[PDB]
Amino acid sequence: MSLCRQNYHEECEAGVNKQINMEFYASYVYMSMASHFDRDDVALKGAHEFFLKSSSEEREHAMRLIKFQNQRGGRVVYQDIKKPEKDAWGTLTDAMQAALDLEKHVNQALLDLHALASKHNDPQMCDFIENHYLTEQVEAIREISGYLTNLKRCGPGLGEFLFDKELNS
Amino acid sequence: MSLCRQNYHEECEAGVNKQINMEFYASYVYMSMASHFDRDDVALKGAHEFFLKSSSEEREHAMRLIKFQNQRGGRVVYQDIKKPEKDAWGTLTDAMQAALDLEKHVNQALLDLHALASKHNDPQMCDFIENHYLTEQVEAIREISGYLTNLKRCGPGLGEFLFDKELNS
Amino acid sequence: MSLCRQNYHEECEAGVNKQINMEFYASYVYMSMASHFDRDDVALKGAHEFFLKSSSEEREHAMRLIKFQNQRGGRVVYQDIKKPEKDAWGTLTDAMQAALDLEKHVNQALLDLHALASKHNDPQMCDFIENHYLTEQVEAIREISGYLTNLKRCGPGLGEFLFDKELNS
Amino acid sequence: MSLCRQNYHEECEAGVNKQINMEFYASYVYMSMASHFDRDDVALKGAHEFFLKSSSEEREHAMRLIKFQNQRGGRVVYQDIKKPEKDAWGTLTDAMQAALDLEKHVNQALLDLHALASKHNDPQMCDFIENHYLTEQVEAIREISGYLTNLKRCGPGLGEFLFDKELNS
Ligand SMILES: [Ag+]
Ligand SMILES: [Ag+]
Ligand SMILES: [Ag+]
Ligand SMILES: [Ag+]
Ligand SMILES: [Ag+]
Ligand SMILES: [Ag+]
Ligand SMILES: [Ag+]
Ligand SMILES: [Ag+]
Ligand SMILES: [Ag+]
Ligand SMILES: [Ag+]
Ligand SMILES: [Ag+]
Ligand SMILES: [Ag+]
Ligand SMILES: [Ag+]
Ligand SMILES: [Ag+]
Ligand SMILES: [Ag+]
Ligand SMILES: [Ag+]
């Protein structure tokens, strides 16, 4: 009766908790991509920066869902952040493909989370997700898709090096 | 045929009119809380300011729904703004509890209003409500909930005085 | 022969990988402490901010070890970031105690890592750790210890609320 | 009894003298690399600038060890700065490989010098070396290693030309 929870279904709460984990996970994947591209034998500084920034943004995404959980009076429950699937992510194209797949996985998760909120008639949650995640995911996915297109266009070797400069700066 | 109304159902219009009254009412409650806390024998200036600001914001909420009504080509119809339930709101905790209850009542009303708009497939109204009210209500409720938590933590007497300073400044 | 690795023992590399995980873990603990203190029923904003900042700094610590790993030509290998031990961290004192314990655990780990580097005659690694971690840990631990002292001094209730204001601002 | 020497072993002094020569030598190598890349028939201005800067920095490294020698009350003793091993350093990759080898040779020398100081319990010398040389060497080596990686990635011809632009600016 002194708590803030209102119109916030347990499934949604749990879906937010899952999404928190997912965003941390994606953060972690990108951290790993970043460090891969900062290997002396890979040495793609643009990719490194790009994936670091993506890692940091994923962390922010997580945190904003954490906040949301608290703002709705849910209870954040953390789970392990699983290690990413690979220790080495290949070429920039390989990693961008993996990133695209991750973002699509995150995006589906968010869409599922939105479907949850819509199912439970939580329009504030829906709005939150739309406002902070959905278009962002769309943008990210489109952006990575274009990267893949240009990576392919640029080709291996020099093209990769030059394309890599074009990430960020 | 020269009017702007389009896709704006009479129930929604009426729901906006009810919500207008509700926001004015909440404004009025907060006005009363404010004046209570500015009694010489209550004299909690932070609460006074906080509730005045909440009153003014509720008024703005009302006005924005008035505007919306007109922008959608509905017709604003005012009702009495009922006096608040109490003339004296007790301690800061008591008033914060009452505020929490009011905000939850407003919030449910808004959620009902959004459900109305969703039922009548008025996505512009839905968006309006989400954009201007829902998250705001969530924020308000969470904020007041935290106040209650801290009021309890701080305890009566000195704690109330000190907590009161922490509202606003 | 085109790689940068020099004087960087496999044990050290592995110790850095462990330390990376540990810093991420500590980051994660602090994230959880932060969100605990942002519960509507806990609502200690200073603690929230303090633990968020500690989480972010732990992340930076991790990242700097990631960087170091790459700068020394080791290979970062991530592991799961385990969920923290608790879902709810108690009072600010309880959490500060837990933080103190975590920082001491991190600190011992770092000291072990430094002992590793010293054992393997990796003075650059030693210096790195001393330059970026050791004094920082000392500072953190002392700082948290003082917090605990003041939390105790301040007492539960009002004291906790007031002490909480004194974290950060 | 009016001199400053204290806790500065003759071997260390001699090791500093050797290191001075080594840094001058490395300076000289880089000078030669620089001039190679400024040949009209080589004409890689980025490499030229990069190696000039590396030459100048190596000179500064030498000078700082000279200073250190004097600050510790040792006696600087110069030896011939031997001419570099090659008159022509090949492609940018070839020279970067040679640079990597030189920096690793310098780095080992410094590590040996640090081991000397540690053996003789000269922590000020150890610190000096750690503070001014070790991490710098690590950085240099990693940097050159990445260059080699990117030179390889970029390939001969156009890639070399483009990679060359990416040194410095
Ligand atoms: Ag819900
Ligand atoms: Ag990384
Ligand atoms: Ag992203
Ligand atoms: Ag919306
Ligand atoms: Ag919407
Ligand atoms: Ag309608
Ligand atoms: Ag008033
Ligand atoms: Ag309000
Ligand atoms: Ag080592
Ligand atoms: Ag948090
Ligand atoms: Ag810390
Ligand atoms: Ag000595
Ligand atoms: Ag020259
Ligand atoms: Ag150098
Ligand atoms: Ag040191
Ligand atoms: Ag040291």
Residue numbers in the entry:
A (entry chain A), B (entry chain A), C (entry chain A), D (entry chain A): 1 to 169
Give the article text.
In the present study, we prepared a marine invertebrate ferritin from Dendrorhynchus zhejiangensis (DzFer) and found that it could withstand extreme pH fluctuation. The majority of ferritins consist of 24 subunits assembled in a highly symmetric manner. They compose a spherical protein shell around a central cavity into which a ferric oxyhydroxide mineral core can be formed. As is well known, these subunits are reversibly assembled into a hollow nanocage with a diameter of ~12 nm and a 4-3-2 symmetrical architecture, resulting in six four-fold, eight three-fold and twelve two-fold channels.
For the soaking method, DzFer crystals grown from condition I were soaked for 1 min in the condition I solution supplemented with 20% glycerol and 100 mM AgNO3. On the basis of the X-ray crystallographic analysis, the refined structure of Ag+-DzFer showed that a total of 88 Ag+ ions were bound to the DzFer nanocage through metal-coordination bonds. Notably, the ferroxidase site was assigned one Ag+ ion because putting the Fe3+ here could produce a prominent negative Fo–Fc electron density map. In the Ag+ cocrystal structure of DzFer, two Ag+-binding sites (Ag1 and Ag2) were observed inside the three-fold channel, whereas the other three Ag+-binding sites (Ag3, Ag4, and Ag5) were observed at the outer surface groove of the Ag+-DzFer shell through metal-coordination bonds. Ag1 was ligated by the carboxylate groups of Glu130 residues at distances of 2.7 Å and three water molecules at distances of 2.3 Å. In the Ag+-DzFer structure, although few studies regarding ferritin with structural data to support this, we observed an argentophilic interaction between Ag1 and Ag2 (the Ag-Ag distance of 2.5 Å), and they coordinated with the negatively charged residues Asp127 and Glu130 at the three-fold channel. Ag4 was ligated by the thiolate group of the Cys12 residue at a distance of 3.1 Å, the carboxylate group of the Asp122 residue at a distance of 2.7 Å, and one water molecule at a distance of 2.7 Å. At the site of Ag5, the Ag+ ion was coordinated with the thioether group of Met31 at a distance of 3.2 Å, the hydroxyl group of Ser35 at a distance of 3.8 Å, and one water molecule at a distance of 2.7 Å.
